[PDB]
Amino acid sequence: MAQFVYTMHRVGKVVPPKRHILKNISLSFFPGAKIGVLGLNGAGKSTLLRIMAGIDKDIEGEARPQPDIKIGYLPQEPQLNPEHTVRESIEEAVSEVVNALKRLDEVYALYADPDADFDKLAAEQGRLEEIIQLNVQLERAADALRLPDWDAKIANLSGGERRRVALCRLLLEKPDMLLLDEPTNHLDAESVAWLERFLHDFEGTVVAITHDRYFLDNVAGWILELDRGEGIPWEGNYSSWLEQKDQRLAQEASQEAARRKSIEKELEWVRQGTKKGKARLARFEELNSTEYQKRNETNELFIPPGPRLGDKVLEVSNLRKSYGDRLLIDDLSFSIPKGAIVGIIGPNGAGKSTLFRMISGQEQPDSGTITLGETVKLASVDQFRDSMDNSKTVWEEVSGGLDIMKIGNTEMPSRAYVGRFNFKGVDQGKRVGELSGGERGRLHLAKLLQVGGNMLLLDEPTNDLDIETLRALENALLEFPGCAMVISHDRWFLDRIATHILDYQDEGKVEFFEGNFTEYEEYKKRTLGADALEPKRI
Amino acid sequence: QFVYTMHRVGKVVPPKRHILKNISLSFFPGAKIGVLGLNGAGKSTLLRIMAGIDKDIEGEARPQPDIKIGYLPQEPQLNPEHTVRESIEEAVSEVVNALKRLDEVYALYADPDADFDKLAAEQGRLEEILNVQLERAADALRLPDWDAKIANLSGGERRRVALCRLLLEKPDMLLLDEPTNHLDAESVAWLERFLHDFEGTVVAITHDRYFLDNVAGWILELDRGEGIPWEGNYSSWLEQKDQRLAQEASQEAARRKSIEKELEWVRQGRQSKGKARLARFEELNSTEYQKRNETNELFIPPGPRLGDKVLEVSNLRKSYGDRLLIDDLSFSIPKGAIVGIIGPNGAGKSTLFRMISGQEQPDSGTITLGETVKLASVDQFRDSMDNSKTVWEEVSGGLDIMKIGNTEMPSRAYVGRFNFKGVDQGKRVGELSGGERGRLHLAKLLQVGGNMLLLDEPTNDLDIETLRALENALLEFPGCAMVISHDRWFLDRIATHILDYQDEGKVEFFEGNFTEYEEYKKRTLGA
């Protein structure tokens, strides 16, 4: 099990009250790897090294070092024996070799005893000489790190003097793995350069918490960033990490901008700047511009344009439909202008969804006529969000595995089309079952609008959406070149986009009106008198 | 005065995750509160706690005694064997029980042993305590027929029944988790009016913007399991949210600009560029030029314009006790020079600054400053005699207006120019990281607006974003700097000269940065 010098599985650390300084840390460490540990103060960098040291065992998950290796650890604040001298503290580091020399003098002294076994002496002496690979080395190391005099008490030493001693011991022990917490503190520039050289040529594994960018750029072959107490391994040095950090910031800036834009659209409406269909039908041609729609592609939600709509879209004449013994619609007539967004309201079971199924040709009227224009291509999106297999992902659900989809008449990357429904790269592998009813609503929308129709029949797309999606949807629809008919009980949504209203009343009565929800209610009140808006059913 | 209070309320969910943490909120009678947040922010848990259902929590969650709370969860809980009528009747059972008692009283008049007074008195209390209110209610929410069995109702119908029940109960406080689900438009408008006219407290989790804009006078937004109350309706909240995204956008652009400056240097490898920095001396000293740097992550006060005569050191000798620190040092510093200072500790690095500052005196030789030179010394210590003070207090001394250099300016603005944002400014010195204390120390001592900065190890404990920001700010500084530092990247980026303190009082002066010096050192001395 030497393939990894250290492993962590779901490692965490809780500090009272219940704060986690680290969470879900799953990482593998390779022998010889040189890793720089980055992260803001409080990201748990130091705790992480204490765990690898074997000092902190009170953790979640499992933290295992390679078996039978030497681990050296440098805390931020050195731990030395105030009574020892510098000489003695350093000599503790080379105990392994000092003990060899002592044993070797014994072996040599054993040669003079007639009961000694030559072969065993010579063999052990050989095994002792094999280990050696001193007083001059210590002097050499001592100079390198500017150590205080050999005779100095640890007590008398400064904090920086103690650090240099602790550092020198560690390097002289030559462990398999060096764990370094801010090793450049209290050192001078040429010493740091010397340290970098040592760390660079060091044959074992180095995990260093440091701000020193020459370390990170010239030694570090991996950057381990700690953020929310979670680990972000990055393969490469400081420079390439820095480039990655920049792109990540540019992405973040891009995502908030897209969404600051969505919010500002609603703000204009709110300010207010009204009083979008007294204007919508007039500027229809402006929406049908190819260059114009190409700019809306970076909007939070972007609905694909259908084929160009003609003047005649939907003509319904004396429409009549019943279900069982219940009259749903009687004598309904209307024409839908191109560009119109028609909000549909009324009590459930009034036959609202039934109209869609009839325009769609899934059901037949009992009487009357429904006529669509020859340029009309329907996109129906029913109210259900139910998945037969909620183990599939957002992207699998929409694409069916296709990398390239024909969205309407146009081929395009499925990833891009999915992204145009505010499903970011990181969200596309989320399973359907893992999504919120809101998100299940965006997905249902994303899946079914792939047909690229210029006439959208949306049955309650708004029922379960969160505010940001509702706003993005409103905005997307205000930009959509074709027609939409939307069954909804969201009044703000209706007032923002609707050019017309179909109002289902009891006994098969259906009222058609030009305006939004609020305009309709006032008109209904104005004509039916007060108590008109007060709902009434059983 | 409070209908409900919460003190440090939090909730922990497997494995160890915190769905709510540190929730301390007071609720007011009649207040109408809209509850917002992303999925998983703990919205529903919050209402469950206030409902008195979830009782396994941290902190203290307590209703006003005697307060009647009606709670609507996302999924209706109704006995499937009762009729709609029966379910509805349960909400008005107190009124119904009175009607039954009333008829007993009416009958009791005919008995001769009955006390008339008590009957009339009890009758009167029964008028304290109108049946049609049910029809109107069932109408308004469009309930299914009275005879309908709940088991036969759909999800929506059951929600209409459960909601109708709740509003008929006339509680003091309504806690509604997504009440508009599966209603029709006009039904929701009716619900809006009801909750608007409702005299008690309403706490509602909804997405309905007309609710949030017309009814709610407060918006309670949950994010990381923490709550941000906002006083105002949806529209004012939206406006505030926009401004928060503008702020976030600008803080990242500042950070992103700092990164892109260092990216430029990295992508080259480079040279000392002292000639570049000398050629730009005029450009750097332009007042309109420096005005653009004010929005940088770190902004150093420009200082007065440096003349040609800056610093001239000649035959400088200094010892401390028996130990020589400096022997026979000579150098002059051209304007705009940034001098990196290196060497082993105790070699006399800080001592040069104390001599330039005039705190200490040279044993031999001279140090001459030009007339235009104004020092700013920043020592290596981060000690505070009272770590209980905030960042702003430590820098400003409580002054709203500070004289920075020769310029009066808001102290909050000055502090912000050292990357202490508003929320950071109230942090106690003791709460700050070592790197933050070093940024505090700089901000504090640079307030003098010197054109010659004597910086003793400002880089020692700083984090990477700060180091990078500091380098960037030094590259924009119109004046001179001498910086003792053991950060070689920092020195390579900004140093135009190097002072290298060696043993026995030897000090070497070189034009170029650290890497250039070292390569030179290896050329004349060897490895």
PDB file of N, CA, C and O in Angstrom, chain A residues 254-289:
ATOM      1  N   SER A 254     -19.365  36.948 -14.825  1.00  0.00           N
ATOM      2  CA  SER A 254     -20.247  36.795 -15.962  1.00  0.00           C
ATOM      3  C   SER A 254     -21.629  36.326 -15.517  1.00  0.00           C
ATOM      4  O   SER A 254     -22.644  36.767 -16.059  1.00  0.00           O
ATOM      5  N   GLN A 255     -21.665  35.444 -14.522  1.00  0.00           N
ATOM      6  CA  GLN A 255     -22.925  34.872 -14.048  1.00  0.00           C
ATOM      7  C   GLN A 255     -23.751  35.872 -13.252  1.00  0.00           C
ATOM      8  O   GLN A 255     -24.978  35.873 -13.334  1.00  0.00           O
ATOM      9  N   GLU A 256     -23.087  36.718 -12.472  1.00  0.00           N
ATOM     10  CA  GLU A 256     -23.811  37.711 -11.694  1.00  0.00           C
ATOM     11  C   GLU A 256     -24.288  38.848 -12.601  1.00  0.00           C
ATOM     12  O   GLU A 256     -25.333  39.439 -12.368  1.00  0.00           O
ATOM     13  N   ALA A 257     -23.514  39.135 -13.642  1.00  0.00           N
ATOM     14  CA  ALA A 257     -23.888  40.151 -14.613  1.00  0.00           C
ATOM     15  C   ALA A 257     -25.144  39.730 -15.360  1.00  0.00           C
ATOM     16  O   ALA A 257     -26.074  40.518 -15.506  1.00  0.00           O
ATOM     17  N   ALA A 258     -25.166  38.485 -15.837  1.00  0.00           N
ATOM     18  CA  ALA A 258     -26.342  37.949 -16.525  1.00  0.00           C
ATOM     19  C   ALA A 258     -27.580  38.137 -15.653  1.00  0.00           C
ATOM     20  O   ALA A 258     -28.676  38.450 -16.134  1.00  0.00           O
ATOM     21  N   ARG A 259     -27.382  37.978 -14.354  1.00  0.00           N
ATOM     22  CA  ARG A 259     -28.491  37.976 -13.432  1.00  0.00           C
ATOM     23  C   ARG A 259     -28.835  39.364 -12.851  1.00  0.00           C
ATOM     24  O   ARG A 259     -29.994  39.642 -12.504  1.00  0.00           O
ATOM     25  N   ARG A 260     -27.830  40.232 -12.773  1.00  0.00           N
ATOM     26  CA  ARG A 260     -28.049  41.632 -12.452  1.00  0.00           C
ATOM     27  C   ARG A 260     -28.898  42.266 -13.565  1.00  0.00           C
ATOM     28  O   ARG A 260     -29.744  43.129 -13.312  1.00  0.00           O
ATOM     29  N   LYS A 261     -28.665  41.808 -14.795  1.00  0.00           N
ATOM     30  CA  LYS A 261     -29.428  42.234 -15.962  1.00  0.00           C
ATOM     31  C   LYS A 261     -30.883  41.779 -15.893  1.00  0.00           C
ATOM     32  O   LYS A 261     -31.788  42.534 -16.248  1.00  0.00           O
ATOM     33  N   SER A 262     -31.109  40.538 -15.459  1.00  0.00           N
ATOM     34  CA  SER A 262     -32.468  40.031 -15.283  1.00  0.00           C
ATOM     35  C   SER A 262     -33.226  40.877 -14.261  1.00  0.00           C
ATOM     36  O   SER A 262     -34.373  41.258 -14.482  1.00  0.00           O
ATOM     37  N   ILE A 263     -32.568  41.159 -13.142  1.00  0.00           N
ATOM     38  CA  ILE A 263     -33.147  41.967 -12.082  1.00  0.00           C
ATOM     39  C   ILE A 263     -33.464  43.390 -12.546  1.00  0.00           C
ATOM     40  O   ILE A 263     -34.473  43.964 -12.159  1.00  0.00           O
ATOM     41  N   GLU A 264     -32.599  43.962 -13.377  1.00  0.00           N
ATOM     42  CA  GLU A 264     -32.783  45.350 -13.784  1.00  0.00           C
ATOM     43  C   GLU A 264     -33.933  45.507 -14.773  1.00  0.00           C
ATOM     44  O   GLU A 264     -34.580  46.560 -14.822  1.00  0.00           O
ATOM     45  N   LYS A 265     -34.197  44.444 -15.534  1.00  0.00           N
ATOM     46  CA  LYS A 265     -35.374  44.396 -16.382  1.00  0.00           C
ATOM     47  C   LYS A 265     -36.639  44.485 -15.551  1.00  0.00           C
ATOM     48  O   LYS A 265     -37.563  45.212 -15.899  1.00  0.00           O
ATOM     49  N   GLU A 266     -36.684  43.752 -14.448  1.00  0.00           N
ATOM     50  CA  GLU A 266     -37.865  43.788 -13.587  1.00  0.00           C
ATOM     51  C   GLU A 266     -37.939  45.136 -12.886  1.00  0.00           C
ATOM     52  O   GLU A 266     -39.023  45.686 -12.718  1.00  0.00           O
ATOM     53  N   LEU A 267     -36.785  45.674 -12.492  1.00  0.00           N
ATOM     54  CA  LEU A 267     -36.753  47.010 -11.887  1.00  0.00           C
ATOM     55  C   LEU A 267     -37.386  48.081 -12.785  1.00  0.00           C
ATOM     56  O   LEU A 267     -38.211  48.849 -12.318  1.00  0.00           O
ATOM     57  N   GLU A 268     -37.026  48.115 -14.064  1.00  0.00           N
ATOM     58  CA  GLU A 268     -37.647  49.069 -14.984  1.00  0.00           C
ATOM     59  C   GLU A 268     -39.167  48.944 -14.938  1.00  0.00           C
ATOM     60  O   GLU A 268     -39.875  49.944 -14.899  1.00  0.00           O
ATOM     61  N   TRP A 269     -39.664  47.716 -14.910  1.00  0.00           N
ATOM     62  CA  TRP A 269     -41.102  47.506 -14.836  1.00  0.00           C
ATOM     63  C   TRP A 269     -41.651  48.032 -13.515  1.00  0.00           C
ATOM     64  O   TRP A 269     -42.746  48.590 -13.462  1.00  0.00           O
ATOM     65  N   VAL A 270     -40.869  47.863 -12.458  1.00  0.00           N
ATOM     66  CA  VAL A 270     -41.313  48.181 -11.105  1.00  0.00           C
ATOM     67  C   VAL A 270     -41.256  49.687 -10.778  1.00  0.00           C
ATOM     68  O   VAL A 270     -42.132  50.221 -10.088  1.00  0.00           O
ATOM     69  N   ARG A 271     -40.246  50.364 -11.314  1.00  0.00           N
ATOM     70  CA  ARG A 271     -39.925  51.759 -10.969  1.00  0.00           C
ATOM     71  C   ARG A 271     -41.045  52.816 -10.779  1.00  0.00           C
ATOM     72  O   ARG A 271     -41.000  53.551  -9.787  1.00  0.00           O
ATOM     73  N   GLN A 272     -42.037  52.924 -11.672  1.00  0.00           N
ATOM     74  CA  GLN A 272     -42.298  52.024 -12.792  1.00  0.00           C
ATOM     75  C   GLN A 272     -42.022  52.642 -14.156  1.00  0.00           C
ATOM     76  O   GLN A 272     -41.863  53.853 -14.290  1.00  0.00           O
ATOM     77  N   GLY A 273     -41.987  51.785 -15.168  1.00  0.00           N
ATOM     78  CA  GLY A 273     -41.804  52.202 -16.542  1.00  0.00           C
ATOM     79  C   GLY A 273     -42.674  51.356 -17.440  1.00  0.00           C
ATOM     80  O   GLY A 273     -42.177  50.558 -18.243  1.00  0.00           O
ATOM     81  N   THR A 274     -43.983  51.522 -17.282  1.00  0.00           N
ATOM     82  CA  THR A 274     -44.973  50.769 -18.051  1.00  0.00           C
ATOM     83  C   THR A 274     -45.728  51.833 -18.927  1.00  0.00           C
ATOM     84  O   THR A 274     -45.030  52.727 -19.405  1.00  0.00           O
ATOM     85  N   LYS A 275     -47.049  51.825 -19.208  1.00  0.00           N
ATOM     86  CA  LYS A 275     -48.094  50.858 -18.863  1.00  0.00           C
ATOM     87  C   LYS A 275     -48.762  50.301 -20.114  1.00  0.00           C
ATOM     88  O   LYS A 275     -48.148  49.566 -20.876  1.00  0.00           O
ATOM     89  N   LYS A 276     -45.862  42.779 -22.396  1.00  0.00           N
ATOM     90  CA  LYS A 276     -45.636  44.208 -22.543  1.00  0.00           C
ATOM     91  C   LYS A 276     -46.416  44.689 -23.759  1.00  0.00           C
ATOM     92  O   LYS A 276     -45.851  45.239 -24.706  1.00  0.00           O
ATOM     93  N   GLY A 277     -47.731  44.499 -23.707  1.00  0.00           N
ATOM     94  CA  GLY A 277     -48.531  44.462 -24.917  1.00  0.00           C
ATOM     95  C   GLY A 277     -49.491  45.562 -25.325  1.00  0.00           C
ATOM     96  O   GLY A 277     -50.540  45.278 -25.908  1.00  0.00           O
ATOM     97  N   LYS A 278     -49.157  46.811 -25.044  1.00  0.00           N
ATOM     98  CA  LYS A 278     -49.752  47.880 -25.826  1.00  0.00           C
ATOM     99  C   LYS A 278     -48.712  48.172 -26.883  1.00  0.00           C
ATOM    100  O   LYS A 278     -49.025  48.613 -27.992  1.00  0.00           O
ATOM    101  N   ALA A 279     -47.467  47.859 -26.525  1.00  0.00           N
ATOM    102  CA  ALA A 279     -46.314  48.030 -27.398  1.00  0.00           C
ATOM    103  C   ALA A 279     -45.883  46.727 -28.073  1.00  0.00           C
ATOM    104  O   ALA A 279     -45.366  46.759 -29.188  1.00  0.00           O
ATOM    105  N   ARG A 280     -46.102  45.590 -27.413  1.00  0.00           N
ATOM    106  CA  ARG A 280     -45.552  44.315 -27.893  1.00  0.00           C
ATOM    107  C   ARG A 280     -45.903  43.956 -29.344  1.00  0.00           C
ATOM    108  O   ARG A 280     -45.021  43.611 -30.135  1.00  0.00           O
ATOM    109  N   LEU A 281     -47.190  44.033 -29.673  1.00  0.00           N
ATOM    110  CA  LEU A 281     -47.689  43.678 -31.000  1.00  0.00           C
ATOM    111  C   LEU A 281     -47.139  44.577 -32.106  1.00  0.00           C
ATOM    112  O   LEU A 281     -47.011  44.160 -33.262  1.00  0.00           O
ATOM    113  N   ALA A 282     -46.823  45.814 -31.745  1.00  0.00           N
ATOM    114  CA  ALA A 282     -46.311  46.774 -32.708  1.00  0.00           C
ATOM    115  C   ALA A 282     -44.857  46.476 -33.099  1.00  0.00           C
ATOM    116  O   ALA A 282     -44.498  46.571 -34.269  1.00  0.00           O
ATOM    117  N   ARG A 283     -44.035  46.099 -32.122  1.00  0.00           N
ATOM    118  CA  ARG A 283     -42.601  45.913 -32.353  1.00  0.00           C
ATOM    119  C   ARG A 283     -42.239  44.455 -32.607  1.00  0.00           C
ATOM    120  O   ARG A 283     -41.097  44.037 -32.411  1.00  0.00           O
ATOM    121  N   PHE A 284     -43.236  43.697 -33.044  1.00  0.00           N
ATOM    122  CA  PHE A 284     -43.082  42.295 -33.405  1.00  0.00           C
ATOM    123  C   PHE A 284     -41.910  42.070 -34.367  1.00  0.00           C
ATOM    124  O   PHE A 284     -41.046  41.230 -34.125  1.00  0.00           O
ATOM    125  N   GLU A 285     -41.890  42.841 -35.449  1.00  0.00           N
ATOM    126  CA  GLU A 285     -40.872  42.728 -36.494  1.00  0.00           C
ATOM    127  C   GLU A 285     -39.446  42.889 -35.955  1.00  0.00           C
ATOM    128  O   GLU A 285     -38.505  42.268 -36.458  1.00  0.00           O
ATOM    129  N   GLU A 286     -39.305  43.736 -34.936  1.00  0.00           N
ATOM    130  CA  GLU A 286     -38.024  43.976 -34.277  1.00  0.00           C
ATOM    131  C   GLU A 286     -37.506  42.711 -33.601  1.00  0.00           C
ATOM    132  O   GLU A 286     -36.303  42.433 -33.617  1.00  0.00           O
ATOM    133  N   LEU A 287     -38.421  41.938 -33.020  1.00  0.00           N
ATOM    134  CA  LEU A 287     -38.051  40.686 -32.369  1.00  0.00           C
ATOM    135  C   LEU A 287     -37.601  39.638 -33.375  1.00  0.00           C
ATOM    136  O   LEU A 287     -36.748  38.806 -33.072  1.00  0.00           O
ATOM    137  N   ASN A 288     -38.172  39.677 -34.575  1.00  0.00           N
ATOM    138  CA  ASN A 288     -37.907  38.638 -35.569  1.00  0.00           C
ATOM    139  C   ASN A 288     -36.570  38.821 -36.272  1.00  0.00           C
ATOM    140  O   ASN A 288     -36.204  38.043 -37.147  1.00  0.00           O
ATOM    141  N   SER A 289     -35.839  39.855 -35.874  1.00  0.00           N
ATOM    142  CA  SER A 289     -34.504  40.092 -36.398  1.00  0.00           C
ATOM    143  C   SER A 289     -33.525  39.028 -35.915  1.00  0.00           C
ATOM    144  O   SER A 289     -33.456  38.727 -34.727  1.00  0.00           O
TER     145      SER A 289
END
